[PDB]
Each structure stands twice: as C-alpha cells, then as structure tokens.
C-alpha cells in the first residue's frame, strides 16, 4: 500500500502539468524504492549503502571515503556494474554487450 | 620418467582465416607455439599426441577487431628431471672442469670435484678424456649419472649429477 | 599503447581491495629514497638519486627505468618507498581505529565478549561485515573494563573464566590527530601510535574475521603506516618552461616536507632530546602525512605552501565534478568531435545533417585497404587533403604513419591490402549528432551526412523538438565513429527514423511546426484552390510522385 | 602465449607456497597422484619409460604423416632394426615437424639408442608385470627403464622403494625383465 | 565450478533476434568483411561491407552464433540460422 | 540522481528486470513485458454502457426469433436457427464476456475504457476492409465454430514467456489477461458478422496480423530500462514552469528525499 | 569536445556498447599495461625489446598479463596506492556469479 500511494502521488506530480508518462517508468522507480523492506531513499545515505559494486557507488557524491572503507574492509567487486566497465574502458554488459558471439565451425565449413 | 600431460592454450585468429581452412591452420600454429618449448612449470614440450582428434570448440570474437580467440585442449608428451633421478646418457662436451652428459633435450653437467679420486683428467689426448685406474671416459662413452641439481633458465633446463655414488659411472 | 608485447591480453572480472603491508611496499619499491632534493646533481641539470627517479619514472624524453626504459610514452612509472621514524596514523582510518580500540581492551588485546554472551553470537550471525562491525561496536562500547570471569549460560553461581587481564579501559575520543583516554578521579595518558600498533598486532584471528577484516588483504594493523609508498613521476608532474626552469607538483613538496620532518625526528633519536619535545615534530610528521593525503580536514589544520596555495590534496584530485572520477573516467574530451552554430534547412530530410566543407576535410575516418574499394581509396589519396573528397593520412601494416600534406611520395603511393586510409567524411555517413544538455535519450541521434558550404550545421526543422534547440545561436555537437561495427551500431540503433516513437510517452516526439504547420491549415480548406500551372510544380516537388496527373 | 594445465587452482595473494622437488616421490604440484583429466576424471598419473615413449611418438608421427597427407591434393614402412630406424626417423621428422624442434630430434636419438626394447608386446608384458606390483608410476617408469642386476643396486638407484618391496621378491621381477629384452 | 550448458531442448529464450543482437551481428560481420574475410554470398557488385553483411544476413549464410547469457551464469547457444529476424 | 540511481537496471533474457547484483526488481518489465513503443490508446467496449446495450451488442441466441442473427449476415444463418449444439459455445462466449465486464469494472473502478494497449485493432479491421473489399451486402462464409474456436486458439499463441513449469504458465496468463479482454471486445460473434462483414480469409488474416504485431511489441532483452525511465521522468520535470498544497518541483524533492516533515501533510477521509 | 556523463547516460539508454567503449578508449584516453598474476598491481617491469617481464618481490616471470584500460584509470590506481590501498586486478572470477 505504501508503494501504491507513492506511485499515485508521483503520478499527480507529473500529471499536474498534464504531461503524460507511461506507467512502466514511474512504476519501475517506485518498485526500485520499495523492493528492499521499506522506503529506500534516493540520496547519498539512501541507496548508495547497498551491496552494489564499490566503484559504482563510488561515482556518486561521497566517493573518496567510500573507497577508503572499501579498501579497509577488504571489499571485492563484481564488475557487473555499468559505471565500472565505463571506468575500465571495456564493453559494458549493456544491450549490445549483454551477450557473446562465436563462430560455429561446422556451419562455417557448410558454406562453399 | 617421461610424462603425458593435458594442456590448454589460447590462440587468437585474424578474420582472414574465417573459412573451411580454419580448423587446419589453428593446429598448424599450435605445433609452432607448443612443440619445442620448455618451462620449469611442465618441463619440455616434445610431441603433441592424436593430431587427428584435437578439440577446438567455438571461439569468441574480440569486440573491437574481428579477431577470434580459441581455447584448445590437447595432450602432449613431456619430460623434466628431478633430484636424485638416476638416468643413463652420453657425453657431448668435456674439458678440465668436468664433462657434460646430454640426456634427451637436456644438458646434464658433472664436475671434476664430484668424480672419484682414482679417476683423473687427461688433456694430452684428442679428444680429451678422463682416465681412471681402469676406465676411460671421452665423448661417445655411456655413463649412468644420478642427477642432484636442476636449474631452469629461459627456454632450457640444466642439471648437475654425480658418478661418485655406487652403481654409477660408465655402462 | 603501441609496441607489441608477448603477453596474453585479457579482461577484468574481479577487483579486490586490500591494504598495503609495509613488507610488500618494501618488496616492490625500486629505490630507497633518502634525499629530499629534487633534480640537479648539486647544481647539475640532471637528477639526484634521491627523489623522482633514483631508478623509477623518466622525464625529459630519456630511457632509464631499471632497464625497462621504453621512454615516457610506454613506461607506467615504478613505485618507490620511504621509511618512517615511527608509526603514524592514516588520515581516513582514524575514525575506524578510534572505534576499534573501543571494542578490544589493551594490555592483553582480545575481544571483550565471548560466545557465552548471547548478544555476541547475535552479532556473529549475519555474514554482512560492515553491519557485523557496527553491531560489535554497539556492544563493546559500554565495556570500559576488561573481563576474565563471567557467569555463562547456566546460573550466576557458575563463574566461567576466560583469558586473563581485566584492566580498566579508557573513554577514548579523537582530538585533532591524536586520541584521548581517561581511566577516585580518572587519569590521562597519551595513546601513542606504537601502543595502538603493538596491541592491534596481538588481536586474535577470529577477532580479525569478526570485525570485517581480512586475513591476507586487509588486517587492522595495516591501518597504521610504517612505510610510505612513493608515487612515480607521472602522478606528480613537472610542468616547466624554457629549459632552466622548474615547476614541480604540490605532491612533490608535501612528500619533501614529510622527508624533512622524518629526518628531523630520526636524528632526534640518536641525539639527546626530551620526550615532550620530539613529539612536537612527531605531530608535525603526522601532520604532513595528513595534509599530503587529505588537506580539506574538518579540523583546524589547513596547511598552505609558500605561495598561499592551500595544496591540492590527493582526495581533492578524486572527488567528483571536474575530478578524477566524475570529470575524467565518466566523461572525457574525446577526439573526432565538432561543434558550431546551427540553422534549419527545409530542403533536407530528417536524418540528414549539413556539415560544412572545412569540418569534412578536418574530420577523418579510418578505412582499410580492400579489393572492394581500392580504386576509390587510391583516388581519394591522390585528391589530397585539400580537394574535398580527399584524405589526409595513410598507415602501413608495419604501423607506420604517412602524412599527405607533407611527405614527398604525395602523388606516388602504392596502396597494399591490409593498409589503412584515413579518408575525409563524405555524404550518407553515420554520425552522432547531439545538443547539450543530454537529459534525454532523444538528445543524441545518428544522422546521415550531407556536405555543404558555409560554417553552419544544417539540420531539418521537424527534429528541433527532441533536441530542444532554437536558432538564436545555439551550438551543437557532433562525433564521428571509427570502426565498422560502431557505425553499424549508430545506423541500426540510433538512427533518427528509429527514434520517432518516444518510449517515454508511447507517442511520436517529432511534429510539424511553424511555416509548415501554419499554411497547411490554410491549404486544407474548401476555400483553398490551385490552378494547373502551380499544381504541376507542386506534384514535381513530391520526390516519390508516381507521375500520375 | 602460455600453456595452462588441467589441474588449475588459484592461490590468491599467497605468492610464497611451492614445495621443493625430491627423489623420494616428491614431484611438483602438477605431478601428484591421480591428476585431473580435462574430461573430468581423476586419471592416474601417466608415466612412461625408454623405448616405450619412442613408440608413442612413433604412432603420433604415423597419424601425423597420414593425416598430414590426407589433405595434400589440390601402405606402411616399418620393421627397421637399429640403424635402419635411426636413418628412417630423420626424413619423417623433417616432413611432419617444423624442423626447428631440435629437442625432438635429440629426444628421439636418446629414445632409440638407449631403447630397452623394440616390440610393443614385450613392453606390454612389462607394463602388466610392473603395474601388477602396485607401485608408484615413477617407480614403474624407473624399474621400467634401468638395468639393475642386484636388489641392492635397484634399492640404491631408487630411494623410493626401500620398505615397499622385499629384496628377493624385487629380484623376481628383474630376472624376468632381463629375459624380456630385444637383443641388438 | 562446472558448466551450465543449457541443452538444445529446454530452450526458454525468445526465438527472435533482438535489435541489439542483430545490430551487433551486422556490426561484427561487416567489420570482419572489411578485415578481408571470406564472404559467403555472391556480392553482385557490392563494395560496402555493411551492405555485404546485410546480404549475408538475408540469406542466413553467416557462420556466427549468439551466446545468450542468463543472470545465474547459464547460457543458451543460438545460431543465426535458427533465429527468426522479424524486426 | 535518478539516472545514477537506476543505470544498471535492464530487461534480462527471461524478461526479468534485475540490477548488477541480480536481485529481481520486476518479474516482467512494466508488469506486462511489453516495449513502450508499440502501445496505443484503445477503448475496451466490454466496460461502458448499460446492460441493455451490452446484451444488444454481444448476445447471440440461436434458439429465438429475435436473438439469432439474420440469415443475411451468414449463409448458414437459416440452417443454424435452433441448432442446440452450437448454443453451448455461444453461451460459453457470452459467459466469458460477462466475466470480463465484471473483472474490468473491478480493476478499473473509474469505468474508464480508453487505455493504452499493444496491437491497434480498429485499424487492422479497416485494412481487411479496403484490402479484401468486402461489401456489406453479401453474407459471410464463416461458421460460428471458426469464430469462437478461432479466437480461442489464437489466445493460446500470444506468448510473452515461453516456459514449461506451472509457475511460468500462470506468470504468462497474468502477463496477458488484460489484452484478451479487448480481443473479445472487438471479436464478438455479433460484431464480427454484424458490424463489419468478415470473410474467412480476412478473418485468418486478422488473426495472423494480430499474432505478429503482438509478438513484435515485446521488450527486447538488453533494453536498459533504468536509464530510460530515469530520463523519461527527468525530462518532463525540466518542462515545469511553476487547494494551496505542495506541488511541482519542491514536492518532488520531498518525495525523492523521503522526508518525514513534508510541507503540506493533509489527508482525505471519505 | 567534452563527452560528459549525460552523453554517457544517453548512449547507455540506446544500448550501443561498442560505441561507448570506442569513445572511452581509442577515441580519447586508452593505454596498455601489464599486470602480475599474484598481486593485482602494476609491478611488472616491461622489457618489450627483450620479452622480459618479472614481478620482483612476488617473483613471477611466467604468469603475467596485459590489459587495455584508460590511462586515467591507471593513474587512479597509482593514486589509491599512493594512499596505501591495493586494488587487486584479476582477470578471472572465482564466485560462480
Ligand atoms: Mg538559447
Ligand atoms: Zn620504466
Ligand atoms: Zn584484556
Ligand atoms: Zn606480484
């Protein structure tokens, strides 16, 4: 019911001007806030406390001290994060990068 | 002593070879990188077994240049000495500091300070040889040596052995 | 970059964060570093074997890198070290150590609550380390006296004894760079670094494992500094001028001062000096360490440097917005880009963009020499970098570069397969065109190229709305792809005709506006009528007219 | 590049953990007991001896010559005793090897000169005889490629038997392997 | 520490090629063509490797294979012949 | 803040919506697994209107003089009048339609019928009209069996999640549901033959186009929705040029910050 | 011209990953560095003209790799090491997920 009242209120915010937005977006956001146990806020002390990658959380506001406590408390990083592949300058597992490609040698030979 | 080991190796491949010839070239390049090599991890690579059945599997394309990385699994015959390994061999080089018995692809060395006291040096002969109270050791001589020390260096392995222990020496 | 190395290229899947051990620092450093002087072999334009390159990184386009050399444009720099006269805190971990000394008593050095305490296993429950440590700290913060005998789970009659030592622990709290502790009237004594280190080293193993610490990567005693890692010259550049001028970085100065106060503190040991007069330079060494890592301390210290500079700390380099992370690694000033004033052209299609000649001759694309186009490529190379459909660079397979405005074989040129031809930009090419701010998926779309005169980016009208741009002098940005798969991405994903339907509102985000939108109503009337002569031109203007009157 | 093995582990951070080799059955971590097979089988550690390995590389070069000529477009020469084998190995190697593998030429030389046998069946009965003893494959190899006329000699040249077999029973096998021998 | 090799049966993913899959396939193949690679279609006068890879796709004569990865670490291997290309 | 808060959220390959840790945010994106592009505002005619117009519009009783279709709207219309084996299927249809009306008046308490759904039918009909040129003066060649059993077999194909186990099956039936109601709203055995004379060929063609367009309108695994939603809300927030209760930008600040002490609390008791 | 964070977010929205990797490497920063096997640091002494490497201390000349990352990130890690924080760079993962 909290998520419901939240989405409804936000919808009155956006629709106050009359501008329309497809349900799925707002619903995605409020889902992101509730899917924890309560109301996870959208601020520094809010969501950047979760188990996310140290560098991913590092690229938001607090930064330095996050790397400090990440180095002290021997954190290990998943590297599944978007921003982290961005830092390493690698193919981010994003849409186009969400899969791999291979050459099946059989079909390769069966074209001649 | 010789071993047979299971080995995996990653080979990159340019898009030029993306045809039916591909399965050939890979193998032809593996033998160029694997055969003849040597490292203290798994000794000397000698020969790769079962050319007719070597596994390749599909390979992924590196996402910037069309190259394709393949992981090849194979088996090979290898060999590397150990401490206290008694092996036979034949000398190749020899002088006043000791003789060099060659075994397989590896150069074992034996020092004058390690031979028995009755065995001494003889440079006044061509080719030079170590003369004893009964035996003579020159070049072609068979000697059984017990390897004591092993050294890895770049792409070769050397060793130090002895003939002073009983049941060793010319055979 | 450049120069092949016989090493297997791989990617990154794990990033493990630890803390340097002084044995590792003293096992990785290439030089000892003792001299606090920079360059000049005593007034000799070179380098003193003391700071920046007794062995490590190179300046002035030279070799010398423990035989590594490879010049500046290859060597990453190698790390040095410098010993310490006495242990010194870390600037960011003081907040931690203050809370660790409150969870384990001194003298002995072990946990204050064993498994017999039922609220202790409740902390040892959830495997989340950063919250387990919060629980243990919330527990042992009350115990200001160590323990040895305690009734277990049975009854208060059955006293179970653990490890000995039950001295009172003080109420420790931070002041400046040091710790304060009060033990009838309580007592006060200095909690020196050597005590905290000598006591953390004897903390038990399961205590490490229970406070979120690691056995091999991050131990608590490594929060106290014993040896400092000297960064290589690339971290602390020397932007100078002319030839006989200097210009070292602030980090070189702070490191220098650290070496000075360290030599003073270490000389005060072999010579006669009082206890409470050496520490006046001990807090000075600790100070220069502090401001060297963090000079924006919330405390009183501020630490300038001669020229009134507040000294750019290390954390000042990294914190976001115009900093290492939010300003470099999450956003760079990439090459192959262009920006200019725009104007709308009602004679282009949606996806087209009018690029001026100068930009077309300035921006380049790397094509490969292939039989399908080698006639075209050679034609372009011979058009040169000043007739529009030309080129400006040719790269051989041996990694060699060939300029086209200079050189002498500027008209010769035998293109061989596998070579690369950096050609100009031509029509119907895929580019990434955008207007800032990029608050919208629609704010960057791919465009087909059309090369035109004058210095204005020319774009269709009915594409102003998803870009939100007016022609009162707004500047637009443009990027050029560089691989075949990249331009394929741009053309089959980011194309303008693809992004007509906006997923943010399940609705087309590209209408018909202004002169188009006005007169089209004037045209759509029962009172609007055209007569023959104009009708025919009207029909011809329709490019896909079927030719039927 | 760098050839990796099947038994692959990951000792992170621990940069100092490598046992020292020894004659008393102390081989590297890559040569323990039933090592790991890439198919997923705890396969027994494979060890060969002289002459036998020459046969292994011999079949490998037979499949290498035949398979090497199957695609040469756009029934067996064997027998050979001693020298007519030494001369015949050369052309086969220079046809079906890069030639640069000088280690292969030397290893074949050593594998035919000190070759204890010639027949496959002989070394087969050798493998059944020694493997029936239930000893280490290193011991099966060494006793499979050394000439020890005395149990004291065998116990001397191999500091791994000792209390693994009695002297005279150890002699029992040597008296058989002395007979099982291809006279040159 | 083994393999989540999803068999040919028990195949759950969509039988259609996502615009991202298609995009990266035409991309990679076009690159390889420009890298002087063997082309498996009669070119009929085509010099742009993007267009040539498009023709390779229309006749389903690409030897490539998509590995669709799943969150748990599993993977379904699909061929460019199997995948319907609607879009 | 939004964009850096939602970046690593994308539709994976099982239409789940997870983050860089794989914790599920949604089990199908948008609670329907549908790409927001191919969605259009339609109107389910099962909800609005009186029950009089409802029965007048959807009821077919072969066992009555006034409730059976005129045999001009179907060749077999005169030799079915009274057929009792088919009135079982007609009654099953009308029962299902009424069940829709109850369910959709239950979920959509406003009674609002204009709602965005995939596949625009009221055009897909006119394409059959001008494409096959059916004059509204000849009788259809469709047995009622083709209509009822045809739609019933069509719903089996409109997939969104391919699976085997019961869980994914129910997840699919809940993933569609609301669409099938419009499908039954526009493919009623009356309207199909009364309002727009459909032949058998045009009917199978409409089923084919419906199946295809529906399959097209599904999300593409890989689509980073987190960023899409983030900017989809941040963009209209910029277009805000600002009963006296907090609204607009500052209210939104209160929402995202999640503050206990909002400016205007207030509550509404009915 | 700057390719700020918003320009990144938009390309993440399109899902064009190869364009982003191109824009963050070959189009701007870009660098090749060698990494030791044990310590995930930049200890390797690349003697490219002699195929000699070594990671002294850890004593490793057999198991050493190379990687392509932006030099900006390299400098970042050298700074975090300048504050006594080891970022162990590993090529292979050991956690199933
Ligand atoms: Mg303006
Ligand atoms: Zn160097
Ligand atoms: Zn105590
Ligand atoms: Zn190392």
Residue numbers in the entry:
A (entry chain A): 1343 to 1454
B (entry chain G): 1 to 171
C (entry chain A): 3 to 185, 195 to 560
D (entry chain D): 3 to 76, 112 to 221
E (entry chain F): 69 to 155
F (entry chain A): 840 to 1081, 1092 to 1119
G (entry chain B): 1128 to 1224
In the authors' words:
To conclude, a new injection system for SFX experiments, referred to as a double-flow focus nozzle (DFFN), enables structural biology experiments at room temperature on samples of high biological importance as demonstrated by the first structures of RNA polymerase II and HPCD determined at non-cryogenic temperatures. The majority of these residues are in RPB2 subunit (amino acid residues 70–76, 335–345, 466–477, 717–722), with others in RPB1 (1174–1187, 1243–1254), the RPB4 N-terminus, RPB6 (69–71) and RPB8 (65–67).
Using pulses from X-ray free-electron lasers (XFEL) with sufficiently short duration to outrun radiation damage, the structures of biological macromolecules can be obtained from nanocrystals at room temperature. The resulting method is referred to as serial femtosecond crystallography (SFX)2. In the double-flow focusing nozzle (DFFN) that we present here, an inner liquid jet is focused by a coaxial faster outer liquid jet that is itself focused by gas as in the traditional GDVN. Our DFFN system reduces sample consumption up to eight fold compared to a GDVN, can inject crystals in their native crystallization buffers, and is suitable for time-resolved mixing experiments and future high repetition rate X-ray sources such as LCLS-II.
